[PDB]
Symmetry: C2
Subunit: 109 residues, 2 copies
């Protein structure tokens, strides 16, 4: 059974028990997606962790795995190991930024 | 300390330890905001709960309180008790819908 959400002339169908929304909601996931689209270069694990105040290596690693499994992030193992958003991950980030922008406005009051 | 997220020519500042992002990420919160903007009439508690597969009364009540406290939802106590988004809650919903739309696309593969 699904939640049906009005969006203009359309309804969006989400299954709360099976949706990538679950992953997206877990602490840090939206921030990981957001930072992976910062700067000009693939980032290593330390770059990512340093960019998110307070995230543990364990949580970062667990979220990265779930993100790779969900097809939103990929790891490149070269002479260094780096991470980047896939086309799908970049699409998510694109829809995320206006939400985060407004959140920042709310956080100011 | 803050996460700084690139958004076009701007950077969005989010404090991961103090942001309404925390609430927004908790299970069901985005779905509660979304359903509160469905239909044509203020909804009662049962209307809301019935619209989100599997949410418990306890979780729904706890999220509604946090949403009221954060200024995104208000309760009207009249001959019946109903809930609606505030101007701020509707702004959140507005930024949320494209994200949820794309999530639904991802859920299909």
């Amino acid at each position: 059974s699904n939640a049906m959400l009005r969006y203009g002339d359309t309804e969006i169908c989400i299954d709360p028990s099976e949706s990538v929304l679950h992953l997206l909601g877990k602490k840090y996931t939206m921030l990981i997606i957001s930072v992976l689209g910062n700067g000009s270069t693939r980032q290593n694990f330390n770059d990512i962790r340093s960019s998110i105040p307070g995230i543990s290596s364990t949580i970062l690693s667990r979220r990265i795995k779930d993100l790779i499994d969900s097809g939103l992030v990929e790891r490149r193992s070269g002479q260094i190991t780096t991470y980047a958003l896939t086309e799908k991950g970049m699409n998510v980030r694109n829809s995320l930024m206006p939400l985060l922008q407004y959140i920042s406005v709310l956080d100011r009051n």
